[PDB]
């Protein structure tokens, strides 16, 4: 509940902790990972997973 990111591409799952999205999907940042571009956000479904920023855009 803060920053919202939008998926540009349809990147599948790469890590058990990572969560796939569909271009146009919005995700909310919940926490940041050891890496920058790499950020952990949740879905509107209440799902929690990490997503590559290089695959999405942060409106914030």
């Amino acid at each position: 509940s803060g920053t919202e990111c939008i998926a540009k591409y349809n990147f599948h799952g790469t890590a058990e902790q990572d969560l796939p999205f569909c271009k146009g999907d919005v995700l909310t940042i919940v926490a940041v990972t050891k890496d920058p571009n790499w950020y952990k956000a949740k879905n509107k479904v209440g799902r929690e997973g990490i997503i590559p920023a290089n695959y999405v855009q942060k409106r914030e």
Binding site: F11, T14, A15, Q17, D18, A31, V32, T33, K34, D35, P36, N37, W38, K40, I50, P52, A53, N54, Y55
Partner: peptide, 18 residues
């Protein structure tokens, strides 16, 4: 080949207490 996402570090399991 396009630019692949960032390296998948396991440290992700830890959240920095910014």
């Amino acid at each position: 080949i396009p630019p692949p996402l960032p390296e998948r570090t396991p440290e992700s399991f830890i959240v920095v207490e910014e």
